[PDB]
Structure formats: structure tokens, C-alpha cells
Design a protein around this motif. Sequence first.
Motif, PDB file in Angstrom:
ATOM      1  N   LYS A  61      39.866  48.792  75.669  1.00  0.00           N
ATOM      2  CA  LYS A  61      38.526  49.338  75.909  1.00  0.00           C
ATOM      3  C   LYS A  61      37.483  48.674  75.016  1.00  0.00           C
ATOM      4  CE  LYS A  61      41.161  53.662  75.020  1.00  0.00           C
ATOM      5  NZ  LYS A  61      41.467  54.656  73.929  1.00  0.00           N
ATOM      6  N   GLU A  62      37.858  48.354  73.775  1.00  0.00           N
ATOM      7  CA  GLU A  62      36.936  47.870  72.753  1.00  0.00           C
ATOM      8  C   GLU A  62      36.427  46.454  73.003  1.00  0.00           C
ATOM      9  OE1 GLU A  62      38.931  48.690  68.841  1.00  0.00           O
ATOM     10  OE2 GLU A  62      39.635  50.441  69.980  1.00  0.00           O
ATOM     11  N   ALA A  63      36.834  45.785  74.073  1.00  0.00           N
ATOM     12  CA  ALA A  63      36.482  44.380  74.195  1.00  0.00           C
ATOM     13  C   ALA A  63      35.095  44.208  74.809  1.00  0.00           C
ATOM     14  CB  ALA A  63      37.517  43.638  75.039  1.00  0.00           C
ATOM     15  N   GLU A  64      34.555  43.004  74.642  1.00  0.00           N
ATOM     16  CA  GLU A  64      33.323  42.630  75.319  1.00  0.00           C
ATOM     17  C   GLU A  64      33.555  42.245  76.771  1.00  0.00           C
ATOM     18  OE1 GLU A  64      31.312  43.770  72.754  1.00  0.00           O
ATOM     19  OE2 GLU A  64      29.983  42.016  72.984  1.00  0.00           O
ATOM     20  N   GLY A  65      34.775  41.874  77.139  1.00  0.00           N
ATOM     21  CA  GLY A  65      34.994  41.398  78.496  1.00  0.00           C
ATOM     22  C   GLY A  65      36.456  41.144  78.783  1.00  0.00           C
ATOM     23  N   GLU A 115      35.699  30.548  57.607  1.00  0.00           N
ATOM     24  CA  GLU A 115      35.268  29.193  57.274  1.00  0.00           C
ATOM     25  C   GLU A 115      34.428  28.539  58.372  1.00  0.00           C
ATOM     26  OE1 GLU A 115      38.981  27.197  56.669  1.00  0.00           O
ATOM     27  OE2 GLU A 115      38.898  26.125  58.599  1.00  0.00           O
ATOM     28  N   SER A 116      34.263  29.192  59.528  1.00  0.00           N
ATOM     29  CA  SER A 116      33.323  28.796  60.574  1.00  0.00           C
ATOM     30  C   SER A 116      33.320  29.838  61.679  1.00  0.00           C
ATOM     31  CB  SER A 116      33.666  27.448  61.199  1.00  0.00           C
ATOM     32  OG  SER A 116      33.296  27.479  62.570  1.00  0.00           O
ATOM     33  N   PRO A 117      32.271  30.641  61.806  1.00  0.00           N
ATOM     34  CA  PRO A 117      32.288  31.699  62.792  1.00  0.00           C
ATOM     35  C   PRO A 117      32.185  31.106  64.180  1.00  0.00           C
ATOM     36  CG  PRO A 117      30.188  31.663  61.554  1.00  0.00           C
ATOM     37  CD  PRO A 117      30.903  30.347  61.354  1.00  0.00           C
ATOM     38  N   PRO A 118      33.063  31.496  65.092  1.00  0.00           N
ATOM     39  CA  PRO A 118      32.948  31.024  66.473  1.00  0.00           C
ATOM     40  C   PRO A 118      31.986  31.893  67.271  1.00  0.00           C
ATOM     41  CG  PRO A 118      35.113  32.015  66.033  1.00  0.00           C
ATOM     42  CD  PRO A 118      34.262  32.316  64.857  1.00  0.00           C
ATOM     43  N   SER A 119      31.571  31.351  68.419  1.00  0.00           N
ATOM     44  CA  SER A 119      30.718  32.103  69.335  1.00  0.00           C
ATOM     45  C   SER A 119      31.488  33.237  70.008  1.00  0.00           C
ATOM     46  CB  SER A 119      30.132  31.165  70.393  1.00  0.00           C
ATOM     47  OG  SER A 119      29.424  30.083  69.799  1.00  0.00           O
ATOM     48  N   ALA A 120      32.728  32.978  70.420  1.00  0.00           N
ATOM     49  CA  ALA A 120      33.533  33.965  71.117  1.00  0.00           C
ATOM     50  C   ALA A 120      34.985  33.844  70.681  1.00  0.00           C
ATOM     51  CB  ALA A 120      33.428  33.806  72.637  1.00  0.00           C
ATOM     52  N   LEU A 121      35.684  34.969  70.723  1.00  0.00           N
ATOM     53  CA  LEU A 121      37.110  35.028  70.449  1.00  0.00           C
ATOM     54  C   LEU A 121      37.823  35.509  71.709  1.00  0.00           C
ATOM     55  CD1 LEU A 121      39.614  35.226  68.539  1.00  0.00           C
ATOM     56  CD2 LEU A 121      38.882  37.618  68.275  1.00  0.00           C
ATOM     57  N   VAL A 122      38.835  34.765  72.157  1.00  0.00           N
ATOM     58  CA  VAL A 122      39.595  35.103  73.362  1.00  0.00           C
ATOM     59  C   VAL A 122      40.987  35.560  72.937  1.00  0.00           C
ATOM     60  CG1 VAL A 122      40.253  34.355  75.669  1.00  0.00           C
ATOM     61  CG2 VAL A 122      38.282  33.328  74.534  1.00  0.00           C
ATOM     62  N   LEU A 123      41.356  36.781  73.305  1.00  0.00           N
ATOM     63  CA  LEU A 123      42.583  37.412  72.846  1.00  0.00           C
ATOM     64  C   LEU A 123      43.566  37.646  73.989  1.00  0.00           C
ATOM     65  CD1 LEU A 123      40.798  39.896  70.664  1.00  0.00           C
ATOM     66  CD2 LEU A 123      42.609  38.492  69.809  1.00  0.00           C
ATOM     67  N   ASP A 124      44.851  37.597  73.655  1.00  0.00           N
ATOM     68  CA  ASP A 124      45.882  38.142  74.521  1.00  0.00           C
ATOM     69  C   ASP A 124      45.899  39.656  74.416  1.00  0.00           C
ATOM     70  OD1 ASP A 124      46.844  35.756  75.548  1.00  0.00           O
ATOM     71  OD2 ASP A 124      48.926  36.444  75.349  1.00  0.00           O
ATOM     72  N   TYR A 125      46.448  40.295  75.441  1.00  0.00           N
ATOM     73  CA  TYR A 125      46.704  41.735  75.374  1.00  0.00           C
ATOM     74  C   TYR A 125      47.459  42.124  74.094  1.00  0.00           C
ATOM     75  CZ  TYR A 125      48.982  46.157  76.654  1.00  0.00           C
ATOM     76  OH  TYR A 125      49.472  47.440  76.651  1.00  0.00           O
ATOM     77  N   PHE A 126      48.436  41.311  73.671  1.00  0.00           N
ATOM     78  CA  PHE A 126      49.265  41.636  72.507  1.00  0.00           C
ATOM     79  C   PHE A 126      48.587  41.357  71.175  1.00  0.00           C
ATOM     80  CE2 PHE A 126      52.941  40.398  75.429  1.00  0.00           C
ATOM     81  CZ  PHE A 126      53.062  41.690  75.891  1.00  0.00           C
ATOM     82  N   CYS A 127      47.382  40.787  71.171  1.00  0.00           N
ATOM     83  CA  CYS A 127      46.725  40.402  69.930  1.00  0.00           C
ATOM     84  C   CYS A 127      45.639  41.384  69.527  1.00  0.00           C
ATOM     85  CB  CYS A 127      46.148  38.997  70.050  1.00  0.00           C
ATOM     86  SG  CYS A 127      47.291  37.800  70.719  1.00  0.00           S
ATOM     87  N   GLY A 128      45.839  42.666  69.802  1.00  0.00           N
ATOM     88  CA  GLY A 128      44.811  43.637  69.497  1.00  0.00           C
ATOM     89  C   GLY A 128      44.637  43.892  68.021  1.00  0.00           C
ATOM     90  N   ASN A 129      45.629  43.542  67.201  1.00  0.00           N
ATOM     91  CA  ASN A 129      45.428  43.664  65.763  1.00  0.00           C
ATOM     92  C   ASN A 129      44.264  42.804  65.320  1.00  0.00           C
ATOM     93  OD1 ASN A 129      48.719  43.782  66.133  1.00  0.00           O
ATOM     94  ND2 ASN A 129      47.870  45.374  64.783  1.00  0.00           N
ATOM     95  N   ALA A 130      44.047  41.681  66.008  1.00  0.00           N
ATOM     96  CA  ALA A 130      42.925  40.813  65.690  1.00  0.00           C
ATOM     97  C   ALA A 130      41.587  41.467  65.987  1.00  0.00           C
ATOM     98  CB  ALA A 130      43.039  39.498  66.456  1.00  0.00           C
ATOM     99  N   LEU A 131      41.556  42.510  66.819  1.00  0.00           N
ATOM    100  CA  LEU A 131      40.290  43.202  67.038  1.00  0.00           C
ATOM    101  C   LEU A 131      39.731  43.733  65.726  1.00  0.00           C
ATOM    102  CD1 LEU A 131      40.301  45.004  70.486  1.00  0.00           C
ATOM    103  CD2 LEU A 131      39.232  42.899  69.720  1.00  0.00           C
ATOM    104  N   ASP A 132      40.612  44.060  64.779  1.00  0.00           N
ATOM    105  CA  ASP A 132      40.149  44.458  63.461  1.00  0.00           C
ATOM    106  C   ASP A 132      39.366  43.333  62.804  1.00  0.00           C
ATOM    107  OD1 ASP A 132      41.174  47.141  63.461  1.00  0.00           O
ATOM    108  OD2 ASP A 132      43.193  46.338  63.116  1.00  0.00           O
ATOM    109  N   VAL A 133      39.837  42.091  62.951  1.00  0.00           N
ATOM    110  CA  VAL A 133      39.177  40.942  62.324  1.00  0.00           C
ATOM    111  C   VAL A 133      37.801  40.695  62.938  1.00  0.00           C
ATOM    112  CG1 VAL A 133      39.303  38.436  62.015  1.00  0.00           C
ATOM    113  CG2 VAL A 133      41.318  39.871  61.581  1.00  0.00           C
ATOM    114  N   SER A 134      37.712  40.715  64.269  1.00  0.00           N
ATOM    115  CA  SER A 134      36.456  40.427  64.960  1.00  0.00           C
ATOM    116  C   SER A 134      35.463  41.575  64.880  1.00  0.00           C
ATOM    117  CB  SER A 134      36.718  40.071  66.432  1.00  0.00           C
ATOM    118  OG  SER A 134      37.194  41.186  67.167  1.00  0.00           O
ATOM    119  N   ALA A 135      35.870  42.703  64.297  1.00  0.00           N
ATOM    120  CA  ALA A 135      34.965  43.809  64.024  1.00  0.00           C
ATOM    121  C   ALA A 135      34.000  43.444  62.895  1.00  0.00           C
ATOM    122  CB  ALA A 135      35.769  45.066  63.688  1.00  0.00           C
TER     123      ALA A 135
END
Length: 429
Positions: A184-188, A86-106
Motif C-alpha cells: 500500500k505504501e508505494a508510489e506506484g 552517497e547519491s540520491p536516486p530519482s526513483a527506487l524500484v522494488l520487488d514485492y519481497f524487498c519491503g524492508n527497503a521501504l524503511d530506507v526510502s522513507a
Amino acid sequence: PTTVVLYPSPGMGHLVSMFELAKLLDRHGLSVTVIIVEPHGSTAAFIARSSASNPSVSFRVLPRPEAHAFDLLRLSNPELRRFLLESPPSALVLDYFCGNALDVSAELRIPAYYFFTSGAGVLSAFLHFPDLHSRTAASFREMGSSPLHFPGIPPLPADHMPVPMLDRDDPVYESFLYFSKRLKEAEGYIINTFEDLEPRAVAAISDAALPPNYCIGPLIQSRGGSECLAWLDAQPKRSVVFLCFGSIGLFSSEQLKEMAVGLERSGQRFLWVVRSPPSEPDLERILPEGFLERTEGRGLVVKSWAPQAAVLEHGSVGGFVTHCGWNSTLEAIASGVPMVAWPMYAEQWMNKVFLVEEMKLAVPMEGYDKDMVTAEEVERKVRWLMESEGGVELRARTERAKERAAASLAEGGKSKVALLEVVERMKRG
Ligand SMILES: O=c1ccn([C@@H]2O[C@H](COP(=O)(O)OP(=O)(O)O)[C@@H](O)[C@H]2O)c(=O)[nH]1
Ligand SMILES: COc1c(O)cc2occ(-c3ccc(O)cc3)c(=O)c2c1O
């Protein structure tokens, strides 16, 4: 206005530390939304205070659909995609434990940063865990004291790996292999450390075959709370040992006896924070008989909680008997208070090895790895902190780290630079 979404993992301690990042980013002109996934202290109370004191940081409670939180987060992947569609953000900041969300930001093509609340030493190990995982069939509890060799950091006794990771045949372990793989898959990497504190550690992860990193700290999260500050004011400068052991009390009453007998026998003034032994605290049911009577005037025992950040800043505090939680370590360094390491749970035993061997800003409390720390050993280390030449030498080393920290943060410093580097990087697509 550039917009970021910070996704902490459930738990107040994770939330409170994402919010620190959030204020920091909105302090550099970002529209930041902390995403909240509620467990099953108080979440509403925190949203209300954060909303009244930092109105520009807004929150987004998701429709609720170590272990349970990994399930709560995998299953909140639907609901998190809805909010980012409903509104794409510029960046997503994740915790180490929130890697399931990497699927979403893919799919959504959204750049993901990890906000890592432990230092670059803990990251290195967590980043190189899956590799070592495949180079051996033995779990870490079996390996005992056998070295784990991780880039940039001292050899770490395998049994100082965090408890969740000690047994392979345990679903929690498999998730840590999942979350570490996904780093490994992160931007930063935004890390709550400064380079000068952990130079050799930053270097090993500052590798090319590895996403960049931005060491932007210390980010410190800055009535019987006021009372221990008053009593502190009552003490000569630098004369009090502070013993405080994080968010979870794990001392038996008989361990608490040794501590009291050891503190009593050291002669030192002490500010000691004690929680209820595991299954509020009854001090005279729990502590050695006559202890409060004998030591009142020389020391103060605090039930469950103290204003630690305040306490550590106080000029009456000359030493810190800590459990090596990362926030408590940062708060101790930034006040230049030297430390005795008594790590207890989570990744603290790790922090301890780095704190004693790599950074050399603390001395261990022998017996943390055993059934009990003796009254003898407690008394020796408190004597050593307040009285010995090693202690003066160590208090000198921390003073340096206090300043390498203050410097890293003020303008031009290495962390401040990293901060603007990652913020600017966030503004570009
Ligand atoms: O009585 C207490 C105990 C802890 N803390 C604070 O709680 C945090 C603990 O975080 P850390 O990562 O050091 O340890 P954890 O609680 O995660 O093991 C730090 O900001 C401490 O200053 C506090 O204010 N009062
Ligand atoms: C109080 O704030 C925080 C925070 O913001 C983030 C954190 O991330 C990780 C750990 C940790 C603990 C045990 C383990 O096995 C692996 C990682 C942690 O303790 C932690 C924390 O305490």
C-alpha cells in the motif's frame, strides 16, 4: 540524467527480470543501477554479460552481511542506505519481497515503485491478503477448496494460495503479511502484464484508495539448445506439443512414466523437457522401457533445459503443456501458442485459475492438485489440444491475445502509454 535504482530480491530469476526492466528504462534514457544482494546460477557471470552487452546498465553489489532471502534482505537495509546516501536516486524500484527497503526510502524521501513480475490478478490477491487474513482465524491449508474472494478475479480455492502462505504458524507466512501490507505504501506499481489481457483485474486495483499502476508488458526475457530447434525445423507447421515445466523439476519418475505413456498414446509429435526427479537426468533409467526407441522420430526428450522463448516462437509448435509460470505464460501468449495448465509450485496454481477461468487461454490438466496426473488424462489433453474443435477454438482465443499484446506494446498501445507515464512520473521529484 535521471537515475533509478532497481532492487531485486536475491535469486537469478528475480535479477534477470529486474534487468529486463532496467534495459527498458535505460532504453528511455534513465541511468539505472541494479542493486544486487547475493544468495548463499552464477551472479558474476550475469554481471559480466549484462555489462558487456548493456554497458549503460551498471550494477552495485552490496557487502553481504524463500526464508533465508527474507533475512538477507532485512539485514541489507544498512548497506542499501549507504549506497543511496552517497547519491540520491530519482526513483527506487522494488520487488514485492524487498519491503524492508521501504524503511530506507522513507527517511531518504525517495519514491518507491514495486516491479511486480506476476499479473494484476496475483497482485489483487496479494494486495487484499492482509484484509482476509484478519477476517478469519483459519489458515489456507485448512480452508481447502473454500472460496477466497478477491477483487477483480475469480474465486480462488484457498489451497491454491502459494505454499509459503498456507500455514499461519510459519515465519515465512508472517513475512508475506509484511510484504503485502507494505504494498500500500508505494508510489506506484509496475506490472508485467497488459490491460487487455487482464482488464477486470487492472480495474479493481486501479482504485483511488490504492497507489496507481502501470501495466508495461509483456516484458519477455528475449549444443543441445540448437538441436531441439533443428529437430523442430524438421516438423510440419503447428504439429508439436511442447511440454516444459519451469526452473525446478518436481515430477517423480513414475509421474514421468504416465506422461510418456500418455504422450506415446496420443500420437502427437512432442518436444518434452524433463529434469531429474527430486530427492542431470538418466532418461533410460527414468522413462518407460523402449520409450526413446519407439518414439524417436515422433518426439524429442530434452535433458533439463530447452531454449523455451525460441521454441515457442517456432511455427512447428501448436500447443504448450505449461506449468503456468508467468514468464512462460507471457512467452506463450506473445507467440499465440495455446496452453494446457499444469501448475506446480510458487504462485502457478493461482496463475492457473486465472488462466483457465478469467483469461480463458488454457485448459487445466486434471490431477495437478492430486498425487499424480494419469497417462489417460495426459493423452486426452494432448489429443484435445492438437485435434479437437475446442482446441481450434482455444487457439483462436490465444491468437487474439497475441494481437492485443502486440498492439499494447507497439506505439500508442495501452502498455506503451503506461510505460511513458511511469517514466515521466519518475523524472519529477
Ligand atoms: O527449460 C527451460 C525452462 C524455462 N525456461 C524459461 O525460464 C523462465 C521461467 O519463468 P516462469 O516465471 O515462467 O517460471 P518459474 O521458473 O519462475 O517457475 C521463462 O522465461 C522460460 O522461458 C527456459 O528458457 N528453458
Ligand atoms: C522467475 O521470476 C520470478 C520473479 O521475477 C518474481 C517472482 O515474484 C513472486 C513469485 C512468487 C512465488 C511464490 C509465492 O508464494 C509468491 C510469489 C515468483 O515466483 C516470482 C518469479 O518466479
